[PDB]
Each structure stands twice: as C-alpha cells, then as structure tokens.
From a paper:
During bacterial translation initiation, the 30S ribosomal subunit, initiation factors, and initiator tRNA define the reading frame of the mRNA. The first step during bacterial translation initiation is the formation of a 30S pre-initiation complex (30S-PIC), which comprises the 30S ribosomal subunit, mRNA, initiator tRNA and all three initiation factors. Upon correct decoding of the start codon by the initiator tRNA, the 30S head shifts from an open to a closed conformation, and the 30S-PIC transitions to a 30S initiation complex (30S-IC). The structures reveal that all three antibiotics bind within the E-site of the 30S and preclude 30S initiation complex formation.
Numbering used by the authors:
A (entry chain O): 2 to 89
B (entry chain U): 2 to 65
C (entry chain K): 13 to 118, 130 to 140
D (entry chain R): 21 to 72
E (entry chain F): 2 to 101
F (entry chain J): 76 to 177
Write the structure that this text describes.
RNA sequence: GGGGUAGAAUUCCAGGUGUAGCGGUGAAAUGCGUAGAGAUCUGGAGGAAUACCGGUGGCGAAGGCGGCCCCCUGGACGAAGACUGACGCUCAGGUGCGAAAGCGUGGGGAGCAAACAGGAUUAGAUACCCUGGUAGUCCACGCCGUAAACGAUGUCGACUUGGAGGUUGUGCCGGCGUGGCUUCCGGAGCUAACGCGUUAAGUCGACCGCCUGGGGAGUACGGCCGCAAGGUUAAAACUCAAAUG
C-alpha cells in the first residue's frame, strides 16, 4: 500500500478538500499512484501472480472510475487524465 | 527419554520409569509412522476420519 | 588389554535384529554380540529372547575389561528393547542410567514406499 | 509471549524439548501460536534446546 | 522502523565486545538511531553446542533505525568471524523495559 | 568372509527347475501362442518344461484331440527341445509331457 | 515473490575402536562383509524436507500454502466517523492463473523411484514381496493446460424457526451484547430417495455455463493450439431395449 503521507498528499492535491477522499479524482489518483508504484515490484518479482491479481483489480477499478467520470463530466475527466498522465 | 537411576532405586522400578518416559515422549509411534511414506492426501484423509470419530463419540456421549 | 571402570551399552534394536555393543565412555568398541550371531536365524532373530542371549554373550565378551557400571543407549523399535537391558542387569552390571537415542528426523528424507501385502 | 522469557516457555516444553498441545496446557489458540514462535526463536538463539 | 537485534559473540572474544557495541550503536545513532534498550546479558551457557562452544557472550539491542542501515549492519555480522549467531527481528513499537 | 567367496562360484551352478504349463483340448490359437512363448522362454534359459493337458468331464471320450495339442507343442519345440518323456495314457485326468533343454 | 539461516535425520567420504556377521522375508535368496562390514565414536561433504506446535485451526479466486528471520507485496475483517454519489450485478468471445505427470535447454542429485537388472512366489507372474536402480522427483527459464481441478452443488442480491461448538475482531459492565469466517446437528420447506436445511438442495430476482436413452465416443473428420506427448471444439453410420439413480 501507499504510506499515510503519500495518501494525504494526493487527497489534498486532487480533492476539493482534505476531507474529500471519496471523489473520483482522488480515487483514480490513489489507484494510479499505487499502480505506478507496483511496476517496480512486478519487474523484479515476475512470478508473484498472487499480488498481480491485486494490481489487475486496481487497474480494473481505475478504468471503471474513469469511464464513470467521462460520462458524468468530460471536463473533469480530461483534466484528470492529463494531470496523472493517463492515456485514457 | 533420559533416565538416571536415582540414589538407591531398584532396576524393575527404574525400568518402568524408562519405558513410561519413552511412552509419553512418543518414540515407537513416531518411528512406525516414519517407516513408510504416506502421501498428503492419505495423511489428510486419516486426519479427517479421526476428527469425525472423535467428534461423533462426543455426540454419542451426549444424547445419552 | 586395558581395564575400564564404567562402560556404555549401545542397543541397536531393529525390527529384524538386535545388536548389543559395549564401548568405553568415548564410544571405543570393547565387545559386541548380536541375536543373529546367538544361534538364531531368520525371524528367530526378531524375538525378545534372542536379544536376551545376545546381551549375555556381549557381557561375556567384556568380562576381561572388568566393567561394573554400564550406561544404556537403546535405539530403534525392536522387540528386544527391554529384554537386553534386563539381561544386562542380570549379568551383574549396575545400570546407572537408561537413554533412548532413536534417530527422529525433524520433517528429513522421504521414506521408502509402503509394502503392499 | 516473549522468546527471552525462558521461565514461562519452559512450562510449555517437555523434558525432550517438545512443545505441549493446547488441549493439555489449556492455552488459548492465539497465545499457543505466539508460544510456538517464541520457543522456535529461543531454540535458534540456543536459549532453549531442540532435542535431548 | 523498530528492530530487535540479539547477537552472540565467541566467549573468548568477550573483550572485543566493548569495541563492537560502540561501532554498531555509533552507526545507528549516525542516522536517527533511537537505542531504546541495550543489555549486555554476558557469557551464558548455551542450550546446545554451536561450533564446539558451550558458552557465548549474548547482547540485546532494541533500536529504531533506517531499514537500510540494519541490512548494512547484518552485512557486518556475517563478516565478523568472532560473532557466531544473530537474530534481527522487527518490533511494532519501541521496547524500553528490561528483559530477564 | 572366506568360504562364501568360494561357495558363490559353487552356487553359480545353475539349478534346473521344471516349469509347468497346462494346456486344454479347447485351447485357442492366440492363447496357445502365449503358452508356447512361455515354453520357449523356459527352454531358452535351460529350464525343463512339464506340459500337462487336463481333461474335464466328457472330454475324456475324445483323448486323441488332447494328444494333437501335445504332439503340436513337441513339433513347434522340435529344434529347441527334446522330449524327455511323451505320455501314453491319461494318468488321473491329465497327460504329462516333460520336455528338456537341448 | 526474493534472500539469508537453524536444528534433526538419511547417504557418502576420512579416521579411531572393534570382530564376524550384516541386511532381508510368509519362508528364502539376490545383495553387503575379513581389501574388516554391521555396530560405536570424532570430523567432513552434499542434497532434500521442515518433528513437536498442529487443531473438521488459519490463509488464498481456484490450483494450493507449514522451521525461524529480514526485504518486497496482494487480499480479508472490526470500530467509530468523514467522503464520492448508482460509479452496480452478470458476462458469449477474449485474457490470465491453473496439482501431478510430461516436454525443451542448462544445472543439481542425499533420500525416494516409473523403466530396467537380479532374487523370490506361482499353473504362469511381463505383478503384488526382496536387493539394486535410470528417467524423474530439486533449481532456473520456457512449454504443456489436464485431475474424483469435488462441496461431483456457477456468480451476485434479498428473504425465511432453532440448538451446540470452533476461530478472529469489537462495545459495554467473568457477565451482558454485537460483527466476520467456520464445524456439527436439526425445524418448516424442499427432495425419487438419500439427504439439504440462514454457509439451502427452502422462498424469490439478475446474468452466464450446461443436459436431452445406453454403447459407438469425448472417438472420427475439419479448424484452432502444442517442440512433442497431446489438448480443445465435436458428429454419424450402426447396434441395443434398455442403460441409470
Ligand atoms: N504366486 C501365485 O501365483 O500365487 C501364490 C499366491 O496366491 C500366494 C499368496 N500371495 C499373496 O497373498 C500376496 N499378497 C501381496 C504380497 C505378496 C504375496 O504374499 C500368499 O498366500 N502369500 C503368503 C506368502 C507366500 C507367498 N508364496 C507362498 N507363500 C502370505 O503370507 N500372504 C499374506 C496374506 O495372504 O495375507 C500377505 O499378503 C503377505 C505378508 N507378507 C507377504 Cl510377502 N505377503
Ligand atoms: K559471522
Ligand atoms: K460486459
Ligand atoms: K537416480
Ligand atoms: K424412505
Ligand atoms: K482435433
Ligand atoms: K442410438
Ligand atoms: Mg486460503
Ligand atoms: Mg485442492
Ligand atoms: Mg461476476
Ligand atoms: Mg512437475
Ligand atoms: Mg529438464
Ligand atoms: Mg530404493
Ligand atoms: Mg521395488
Ligand atoms: Mg475435465
Ligand atoms: Mg465437474
Ligand atoms: Mg442438517
Ligand atoms: Mg434437487
Ligand atoms: Mg480427442
């Protein structure tokens, strides 16, 4: 997992407030942070299939949240993916 | 099972203590189980049937 | 020859056979005798009585060393575990202690397959 | 449970140096697991014996 | 991140232990070392022989440190031919209170 | 460990046992060939081969059909065995042909 | 997932002591031993596996996972809140994971052991039993994609009497509650019956997979996949009047 400080940074950045942990921006930012963090793990540990199942769940949850944000508000979507550097 | 014969003890009494030390420690039962290879499915199956027996005796102790 | 005050009786009690060996305290062999060498052959070896006889002949082998104390070191699940030491005490050694030295692996190597009989 | 607390641990090993079941000693399952870890750590440091 | 380091020294090399305990703590206290506990247990009787030795000089240390410096300390124990055995553990919290 | 290392070579003296293969009148070709291959294996390795042919019930009437089978095995193992004894009558309810290795 | 490491044991090697057996079976023999075995003791080498704890205990989607320690890492659960605001459920095709055996390449090889060799047994003995023993079992990387891969029970959600346990949280004052997971019994109900029974095989809803007499056959042919072994998809003629629970 991410550290409490790493989490608290993202919530402040991508949220409307520090209290706002729920927003799709924060959620996607949190998922992105961890997904990108674990790329180093699975580079070394190629055979760690049990952990990788957790990574695919993050990617699947991010995709679903982004797709929700797209049809909810394209402006928020377009801003978010460019900030995080997501293709889609 | 290490049995020093204590200050003035008979042999027959001392032998009973040695045999009992082995019986509690579990040496003859241990050697016999390690004589032949038991594959995990057999081990698990044996452990289940014991658990069923043990528990079923308690339900026979109860209802009576 | 040398005199030895205190000895050690190693009893290799297998299922098929009993080996009794008296050593020094540092495990130097003084004399040995087996149930197989006691005029028992085949499955005659694997009785308590054949072990008893093997003990007696082992005692007779180490009369010259002049031993009165023995420490017993029984090993294995053999039928002649207790019959050896009983017969050793009958030879007139003061049995100071009895130890079980049966090798148990803490897992160790895979045993042979079960006999289908 | 502590691996350094040899006094308490010695109550839950036999003469040979084997861990006693929780059914015998009446230990709770959670503490029995901590006990077993402690004893094995003590065994590594040669504070307790494995065998004999 | 809160460790507990026991190490056992060759009982003849009990005189080296003074100098080594300094080096280890000096390295730890170099990088935000919080020596919560330090107990020279002394030359105890071993429960079984390690390398034909029936005694060894035990030491305990409960420290908070970087997770790099402890791995770097573990590297030294391997190289230290005097020190015969060591268990580095992870504790959740600091232990200040005394052990028997 | 002295006399055994001589008696090993004395034990090497091969002990020719008799191997019994039992035929019937009804025995079919495929099964005859199995039993023949068994007999070949024995006589190849220098083992004698007792060859019974058992009758059951009213097969005792037609004895000559039994004799054909015993005659046939002799013929098939003509160059691989000699007939130590060929049967004449049905002793009991059997006719025994002991072959020998060449 | 990765790395390190501990103790026990088997084998082997080198020594010491020692002397005629050892080993094995239903009974034997092969085998091993006077070039000194087996036994016992000291030291060394190497590989594989982790006694006790250990539990109808735990964890994991399933397969599966068991010394201890560290590093990296996934999930689950509880307590109070705060936050987002239907973002959900299922899922043909697709993608990945997937015991053991097996395959390729290179290592490793203690113990075990298909094949095989010898010894027995027997009517025969291509076996069961005995002594050996190669692949393999172990590691790396790649392949294979199947198992009674089973709870022979798809996934998700709601509802519907009880009793006795286990394991793991938590509140309150051992007691009194309240969550998660799990074992056994049993009520209504259901079921051909056996049984299942709030972890349903009950009462309902969503979506998927699958069945339509037995044998022929999970076979042939074709496609796809595989280095191969084979896997996957999957008929028909024909024949039987059954097969089956
Ligand atoms: N050979 C032939 O064609 O026929 C003869 C056969 O029927 C003999 C019969 N055999 C058995 O049961 C097998 N059971 C499995 C283990 C091996 C074997 O034993 C049998 O009676 N055995 C005796 C021993 C024996 C072999 N040859 C002559 N006698 C036996 O002791 N059998 C035991 C039993 O029947 O319970 C048991 O099987 C056993 C113990 N130890 C051994 Cl070896 N076998
Ligand atoms: K060292
Ligand atoms: K879909
Ligand atoms: K091999
Ligand atoms: K009925
Ligand atoms: K095909
Ligand atoms: K048909
Ligand atoms: Mg699990
Ligand atoms: Mg399974
Ligand atoms: Mg679904
Ligand atoms: Mg495999
Ligand atoms: Mg290979
Ligand atoms: Mg073998
Ligand atoms: Mg075999
Ligand atoms: Mg299948
Ligand atoms: Mg199925
Ligand atoms: Mg029920
Ligand atoms: Mg039904
Ligand atoms: Mg096919």
């Amino acid at each position: 997992s991410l550290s409490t400080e790493a989490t608290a940074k993202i919530v402040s950045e991508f949220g409307r407030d520090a209290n706002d942990t729920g927003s799709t921006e924060v959620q996607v930012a949190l998922l992105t942070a961890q997904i990108n963090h674990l790329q180093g793990h699975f580079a070394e540990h190629k055979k760690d299939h049990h952990s990788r199942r957790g990574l695919l769940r993050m990617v699947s949850q991010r995709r679903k949240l982004l797709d929700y944000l797209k049809r909810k508000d394209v402006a928020r979507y377009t801003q978010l993916i460019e900030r995080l550097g997501l293709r889609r | 099972p290490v049995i020093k014969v204590r200050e003035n003890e008979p042999f027959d009494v001392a032998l009973r203590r040695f045999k009992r030390s082995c019986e509690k420690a579990g040496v003859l039962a241990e050697v016999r189980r390690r004589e032949f290879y038991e594959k995990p499915t057999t081990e698990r199956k044996r452990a289940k049937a014991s658990a069923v027996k043990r528990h079923a005796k308690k339900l026979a102790r109860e209802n009576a | 020859r040398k005199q030895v005050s205190d000895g050690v009786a190693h009893i290799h009690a297998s299922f098929n056979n009993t080996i009794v060996t008296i050593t020094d305290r540092q495990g130097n062999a003084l004399g040995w005798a087996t149930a197989g060498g006691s005029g028992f052959r085949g499955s005659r070896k694997s009785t308590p009585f054949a072990a008893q006889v093997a003990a007696e002949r082992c005692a007779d082998a180490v009369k010259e060393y002049g031993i009165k104390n023995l420490e017993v070191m029984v090993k294995g699940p053999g039928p002649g575990r207790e019959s050896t030491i009983r017969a050793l005490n009958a030879a007139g050694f003061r049995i100071t202690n009895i130890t079980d030295v049966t090798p148990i692996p803490h897992x160790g190597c895979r045993p042979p397959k079960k006999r289908r009989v | 449970i502590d691996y350094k607390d040899i006094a308490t641990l010695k109550n839950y090993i036999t003469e040979s140096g084997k861990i006693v079941p929780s059914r015998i000693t009446g230990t709770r399952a959670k503490y029995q697991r901590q006990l077993a870890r402690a004893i094995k750590r003590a065994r590594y440091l040669s504070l307790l014996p494995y065998t004999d | 991140r809160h460790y507990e380091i026991v190490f056992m020294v060759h009982p003849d090399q009990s005189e080296q232990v003074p100098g080594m305990i300094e080096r280890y703590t000096a390295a730890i206290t170099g990088a935000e070392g919080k020596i919560h506990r330090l107990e020279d247990w002394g030359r105890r009787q071993l429960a079984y022989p390690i390398n034909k030795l029936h005694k060894a000089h035990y030491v305990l240390m409960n420290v908070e440190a970087p997770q790099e410096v402890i791995d770097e300390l573990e590297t030294t124990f391997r190289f230290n031919d005097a020190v015969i055995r060591s268990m580095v553990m992870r504790t959740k919290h600091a232990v200040t209170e005394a052990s028997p | 460990e002295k006399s055994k290392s001589s008696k090993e070579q004395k034990k090497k003296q091969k002990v020719i046992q008799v191997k019994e293969i039992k035929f019937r009148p009804g025995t079919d070709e495929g099964d005859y060939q199995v039993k023949l291959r068994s007999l070949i294996r024995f006589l190849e390795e220098g083992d004698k081969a007792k060859i019974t042919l058992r009758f059951r019930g009213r097969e005792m009437a037609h004895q000559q059909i039994g004799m054909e089978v015993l005659n046939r095995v002799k013929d098939d193992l003509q160059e691989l065995a000699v007939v130590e004894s060929f049967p004449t009558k049905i002793e009991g309810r059997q006719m025994i042909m002991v072959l020998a290795p060449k």
